[PDB]
């Protein structure tokens, strides 16, 4: 289930910095940017592989790639904002 939809300015900046850097194709900070997300658990729509890939939302401070993640999905302006570890997501409005 997909837990609403947020305004890209409410999110944390680094969150417009992986949507820029994803608008470029990259380069990206980590290795795991750009790779598919399964949506192994279909918290997310029903979609086929490689629907959705997923990239890092840089948490200040952090050492390892932290808890934020942006996960894109094929539609346009179809993205996916996590904070909590995959544990939820919310539909990413990009004109607000």
């Not at 795991?32 to 401070?61: A, C, K």
């Not at 952090?62 to 179809?78: D, H, K, L």
């Amino acid at each position: 289930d997909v837990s609403g939809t947020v305004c890209l300015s409410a999110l944390p900046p680094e969150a417009t910095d992986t949507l820029n850097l994803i608008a470029s194709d990259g380069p990206f900070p980590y290795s795991q940017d750009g790779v598919v997300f399964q949506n192994r658990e279909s918290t997310l729509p029903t979609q086929s592989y490689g629907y959705y890939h997923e990239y890092t939302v840089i948490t200040p401070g952090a050492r390892t790639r932290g808890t934020r993640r942006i996960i894109t999905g094929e539609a346009t302006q179809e993205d996916y904002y996590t904070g909590d570890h995959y544990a939820t997501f919310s539909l990413i409005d990009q004109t607000c």
